[PDB]
Amino acid sequence: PALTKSQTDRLEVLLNPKDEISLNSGKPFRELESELLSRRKKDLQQIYAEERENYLGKLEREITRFFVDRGFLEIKSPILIPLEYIERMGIDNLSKQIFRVDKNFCLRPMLAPNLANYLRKLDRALPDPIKIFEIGPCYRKESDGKEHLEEFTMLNFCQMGSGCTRENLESIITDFLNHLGIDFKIVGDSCMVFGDTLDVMHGDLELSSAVVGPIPLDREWGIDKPWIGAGFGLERLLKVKHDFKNIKRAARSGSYYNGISTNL
Amino acid sequence: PALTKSQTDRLEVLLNPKDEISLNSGKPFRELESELLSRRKKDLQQIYAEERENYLGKLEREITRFFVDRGFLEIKSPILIPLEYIERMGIDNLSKQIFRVDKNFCLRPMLAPNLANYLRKLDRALPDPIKIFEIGPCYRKESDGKEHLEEFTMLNFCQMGSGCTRENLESIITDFLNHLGIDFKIVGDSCMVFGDTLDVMHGDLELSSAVVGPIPLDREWGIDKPWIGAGFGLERLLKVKHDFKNIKRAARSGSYYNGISTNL
Ligand SMILES: Nc1ncnc2c1ncn2[C@@H]1O[C@H](COP(=O)(O)OP(=O)(O)OP(=O)(O)O)[C@@H](O)[C@H]1O
Ligand SMILES: Nc1ncnc2c1ncn2[C@@H]1O[C@H](COP(=O)(O)OP(=O)(O)OP(=O)(O)O)[C@@H](O)[C@H]1O
Ligand SMILES: Nc1ccc(COC(=O)NCCCC[C@H](N)C(=O)O)cn1
Ligand SMILES: Nc1ccc(COC(=O)NCCCC[C@H](N)C(=O)O)cn1
Ligand SMILES: [K+]
Ligand SMILES: [K+]
Ligand SMILES: [K+]
Ligand SMILES: [K+]
Ligand SMILES: [K+]
Ligand SMILES: [K+]
Ligand SMILES: [Mg+2]
Ligand SMILES: [Mg+2]
Ligand SMILES: [Mg+2]
Ligand SMILES: [Mg+2]
Ligand SMILES: [Mg+2]
Ligand SMILES: [Mg+2]
User: B257 and B147, same structural domain?
Assistant: First the structure.
């Protein structure tokens, strides 16, 4: 017998990349569902008995240790930010992707504006070079795709002062992704906010956009020294590490725990 | 000479609890400001040279290790949640404290609704008892006070099944606060959502509200077993640990780093 779209969708929810199960071999839906339910219950029971850490939380902690140990200050800045930061970043009325809150606020779509404010302020107190990073939630309205979430998690690290060359930026990216065990290439791209970017690609998947300053936008943020920085999506890193078909498996969710369906 | 309100406000920004400086001793504002600026620059330089971890991030990691090691599963759930969860939690049209997003969403004011969904779903797969926790941002519109932030960080841990007694709840709270070195007492209180609470107090400062289920609200969330849980504000824990006068010192902010003014 043949499987309906609803039946295939249910089996796909329960299927994991490590499995080797053909959904349309002729085995009835009831037995495919029962087999996958048993595998997923066993997987969740093993996590509960032996590990207990959330993939997104554990990755944030691993990344934090990497950057702290390399001399970058750990930042935790507001998620709810002034709407004025949007226009000030050069997001001309992308601007359609912004989640507005009340009338003067929004959910941050990126970490860069708050990190620019920290670079400017810390430059008055700390020795050259200034090295900082932040990991946390960012928000964009997106067309539902396999690589986009509306609520995702960004890492942005950046440096201002000496050492702010393309070669040093590439070297940090290389050390970071070598630490995570992720192969990549660098390709040029461009964006409306920062201009030319160095995009870090794993196949066709964009892991990061990186920027070598100065850029004209600097003046609007009081930045007046060379700088480099890069933004990475943590859910995309997890998608690569675990071979997930859809980025939803990696997201903050009530529907998946460490890539395992919670509808069991 | 006498200090103006603006001058006193500036010195208070730069003052830290460890300092022993009288603002109205007769010393001129210029010298008090210069002394405090030097102390704060030295403090920030020491953090940058030797530690580099953000207080809120470090506390979240310490708390995460405590609960993971005691058998609780680490959850990371959505911050942007359906507005329908508000009415379903019994927040009758407090409801005025909700940050609305678009027309059907809001910023979560607490972690409990997402954790209730996880308890229900995990009970179908995991052995008794189910023990989970989450740490992350929550949002409430508040009257500007010394103990309230509009963007704050909650820990909520909870357990469902066996062991869900008042004595076990108090024992977990005691072990947790003993681990952090924070003295407390338990006092009864009540709230409109959960009914009677056990409030964990440090002096007059409410560190937590805790609940022993079942409660009538359970039916609306599909919860049908005994449960216990408690919610704690991380910024309030930091305020106690570091003797901050105002909770702003502990918050996500561009204005303070580990309680040190960034306006230097
Ligand atoms: N909606 C999203 N969901 C998940 N990750 C995202 C999303 N948007 C951006 N990212 C991640 O954040 C990084 C930096 O943000 P950036 O502004 O460069 O994204 P982007 O160029 O718009 O990405 P894309 O072209 O895939 O939409 C991206 O390289 C990606 O890893
Ligand atoms: N606006 C806020 N800013 C900082 N922490 C908060 C805030 N609201 C709640 N908390 C923290 O979260 C815990 C659990 O939330 P709960 O709903 O019990 O707060 P609450 O009873 O409204 O607190 P309060 O009476 O001080 O307003 C509180 O005990 C407190 O530690
Ligand atoms: N003027 C300044 C100065 C310094 C910074 C520090 O921030 C950075 O390192 N940016 C790096 C690119 C991240 C990609 C981004 N998420 C985007 O939407 O393309 C910001 N602005
Ligand atoms: N029906 C159910 C069942 C289980 C849970 C799990 O969540 C909890 O442990 N709550 C503990 C109290 C936290 C205080 C809260 N921030 C407030 O606003 O008073 C929730 N609901
Ligand atoms: K598979
Ligand atoms: K998606
Ligand atoms: K999400
Ligand atoms: K003082
Ligand atoms: K406040
Ligand atoms: K804040
Ligand atoms: Mg995009
Ligand atoms: Mg792109
Ligand atoms: Mg990009
Ligand atoms: Mg309150
Ligand atoms: Mg209260
Ligand atoms: Mg309370």
Answer: yes
Of A73, A220, A125, nearest to B263 by C-alpha is A125
On whether both B134 and B240 belong to a single domain, the answer is yes
Range of the domain at B48: 1-52
Nearest atom of ligand 4 to the alpha carbon of B119: 4
Cα–Cα distance list, B162 to B12, B72, B165, B213 (Å): 50, 14, 8, 12
Chain A environment of B78 (Cβ under 8 Å): 151, 252-254
Closest C-alpha among A122, A136, A138 to residue A86 = A138
> Does B1 touch chain A if contact means CB atoms closer than 8 Å?
no
- Please name the residues between 95 and 114 in chain A that touch chain B, using a CB distance below 8 Å: 99-102, 107, 114
Site of tokens 């080797």: A20
Task: Report the separation in Å between the CA atom of A65 and the middle of ligand 1, taken as the mean of its atom positions.
Answer: 23
Residue of B nearest to A118 (CA): B254
Residue B154: phi, psi to the nearest 5? -105, 145
CB-side neighbour CA atoms (13 Å) of B150: 16
**Do residues A228 and A128 lie in contact, with contact meaning Cβ atoms separated by under 8 Å?**
no
Domain count, chain B: 2
CA–CA distance, B160 with B126 (Å, rounded to integer): 11
* CATH number of the structural domain spanning residue A71: 3.30.930.10
* B54 to A75: CB separation less than 8 angstroms, yes or no: yes
Please provide the size of chain B in residues.
264
Q: Kindly provide the resolution of this structure in angstroms, with one decimal.
A: 1.4
Beta bridge partners of residue B189, listed in sequence order: B197
Q: Which of A209, A239, A241, A248 to mutate to test the pocket of ligand 1 (most atoms within 8 A of CB)?
A: A209
One domain for residues A74 and A116: yes
Both B104 and B215 in one domain: the answer is yes
Tokens of B143: 């009257």
